[model samples]
Target: PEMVRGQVFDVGPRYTNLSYIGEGAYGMVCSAYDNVNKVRVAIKKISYCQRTLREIKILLRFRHENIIGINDIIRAPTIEQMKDVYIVQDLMETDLYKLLKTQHLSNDHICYFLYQILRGLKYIHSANVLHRDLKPSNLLLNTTCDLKICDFGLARVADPDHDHTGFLTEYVATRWYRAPEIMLNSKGYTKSIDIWSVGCILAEMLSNRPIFPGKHYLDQLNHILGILGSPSQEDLNCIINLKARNYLLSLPHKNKVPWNRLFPNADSKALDLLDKMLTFNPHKRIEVEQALAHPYLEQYYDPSDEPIAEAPFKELDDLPKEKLKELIFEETARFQP
Candidate 1:
């Protein structure tokens, strides 16, 4: 039921031989000692499926305190013959999912975690990208209660003009925290979808249970409806997926559950932020800047601290596997001595 891993990993002599600390679709992630920097790091090994290069590109695009950036990219024995890529990153003790399940969160603790996520997310969204598959497990954490967004495999360009983010056609992912637009496969979904995840995470922090524990995709929609109430006609009209739109046409009407009943002990400000963040329509959901400025997070808010991306990247889906490898290797070479 808990995260566990202990696999052997070897690449270059620069780092110590390693043992894996985690595993996900991206591949096995190992904990290694960086001989070059004299620090322990997480070395993630994933093949050149397009997202791997997209992942590398995304991390390199923005450098932020709260968002995880690549420390180094392992050089392949032969760029021409390389089949898999290894990237170096800071080693964090655990993910928010593990932390939330194991520890009790305080009001300040909740505010701190939510604030940092919004801060990093401001930059992520600034780059005109969306971290489509956001969930507690995707949020990496360490002792300073530091939380960084991880897992860029499912990240997509926000602009419809250049989007290859097949988020609509597939990706029935992160159902518990997935937005209404995403689950319905609505095209041109906004960065607000990620904002929806934060709302779910904040609720989980407050309730110690997943707010929308949907059994399946349909059930997930029902769980969200149970709390947020019925979707407005405009919201349903946006569901371009005919089946999804048709299903909504026949759904039973339900009144929104008052936030106080959901978390009576929570602060009014916290509830207000949650209310805005979880709006049924993506168009009406709170933006990262608005949520960061909410009174609930004022204790730690700073405009300068929650800065936007300095340089951003867009358009990568066009590259073939071979090209992706070349791009990734070029990125790796930047760290080479």
Candidate 2:
């Protein structure tokens, strides 16, 4: 199907009420109901603050079964001196972080979610697009338990000619999910950086806590060393701008945590996948596409099953826009520590 665009009120006739979903780098989202078709929709309102058409243009390229679908984009035409733009998408029932934090995730569910994430990532990479942000919050899950990668504010085209060393180096990703090479000021970074973040995310999912929850950037390095141990002089020589003389260069004692420690009660297949994802050498990192071939995911995700990955959430299309807005507002207003 072709990507439908422009101000098509007829396509979204049920766009009534503004259900507030939540906030992101740009704006908040809400649910809209199509009264004409009796289907619910997701409407995102972008603020005039530092937003750009280039970002949307890039994200519009996101089209895959695993990625959130962007149905349409409507420029709300200078309202109240605001050059605000609105994006319409399929409203997801829940996000991975919300689901996992609110309820327990079985081994099967984790594997399934991770599998979809890998599928989405593989699609993104195939399109030569970089999903700089791959955290759980950015992962949207439908009532069917299917996943869609969302949020492209930090995403960039993986082209070398368009890159600036200092600008790219200073800002790569969140401190926790940052790759070692990027942290060491390497300009020759590539999709491997994303693989590094996936490793961290997958490891944490197994443990139910952040693998490298460092309070500081330097502490993040220490955390990596504690788990995987420090790299050798030969390894450090490989990274650009990393000098052996700079910081406290010591052969730090190996503080390796056993693979079983993270998932003491989980299946062997889950642990196996974690090991492959968390490999220290980025070069040897498991390709995101290969993650599905892992025994964990392959064993589960029965095609005949329902999207029970998140049973509590209702279909966005089913709910009225007003009711959807209220639901999102309540969800966003929940207590956060």
Candidate 3:
């Protein structure tokens, strides 16, 4: 049966599925063996949309070690049958979420894992793209400790100048990793949201658990408040929504817990870097390069490891649902050889 909205393709000629891996907004994922290349690969049956088009465009442009690479795209021959499409990419032993279930990563492992994430993010951001949804499950890894950032469905081109306040969706990122500014419904955000997510991931690595495990949007804010305390008056002033700002100010003051107490076993340098990354103000959050060069990850930073990301975004109008279908069909036509 098809796991998503589109019909599933009979992908048996070139690849053979060995096991079911998982399912996501895109579609079903399976582990398969590529007979042609004699390599293990993961196949995803993606639901078509403008989001899917953006993902494919980014994957086609990126070629970095830390960023997952797309191997091939398979679809029906004609436009009418193009609703269901498959994306083929390298398979990993497991993701960070599964890995953390068994292994409590050492500080060295944590630093290196964070370094690779930052490396991939730097490339993505440098290309003027924002990976809005980043979390443990989205990071694919192997036994060698190599990590690759995957799942670009929620990614979008960064619009630094545009006022996206109420226009932007509040549900972009997983609740556990969402930034405070986003939670407050700020109209304008930047690449710093990704930085905030990386900070959350780093905290999770240190404790072997999610830092802010909120049940919903409001609960998520409470969790953040318990750890980082109330946002300053200046911070609250930046929130464009008057109702959101008033509500935050009305909450009782909660003093922040010291980082040393929270991460007693972690190194001082590591805690320092985490503090910078987790700053409440998005503008003040640590940048990808700064994170890469932090003392905790200095040994792993490489100046020559830049990715060649050259894809430019298409100047399509704000596509409606029907038009999204048209754009996807057009993209499929151009993609198929």
Q: Who wins the lDDT comparison?
A: 3
Which residue runs of candidate 1 sit more than 4 Å off their true CA positions? 1-8, 160-169, 233-246
Q: Between the candidate structures 2 and 3, which one is better when assessed by lDDT? A: 3
Q: Which pairs clash in model 2?
A: 14-33, 14-34, 14-35, 19-325, 40-317, 144-307
- Compare the candidates by TM-score and give the number of the best one: 3
Task: Please write out the lDDT profile of model 1 over residues 163-231, one tens digit for every residue.
Answer: 223223454457798776655755434687789989999999898889999877667778998888988
51-164, model 3: which lDDT tens digit per residue?
787877778778889989888787777667666677888989988998887889988899889989999998888887888888998999987989999988778778867634
> Candidate 2: where is the Cα deviation over 4 Å?
1-14, 48-54, 77-82, 159-169, 244-248, 300-337
In terms of lDDT, the poorest run of 10 residues in model 3 is 1-10
Q: In model 1, where is the ten-residue run with the lowest total lDDT?
A: 1-10
Of models 1 and 3, which has the larger lDDT?
3
Instruction: Show the colliding residue pairs in model 3.
Output: 165-187
- Give the per-residue lDDT of model 2 (tens digit) for 282-313: 66768766665677787644434312121110
Let me know the TM-score candidate 1 reaches against the reference structure.
Answer: 0.89
- Predictions in order: lDDT: 0.79, 0.61, 0.80
The lDDT ranking, best first, is: 3, 1, 2
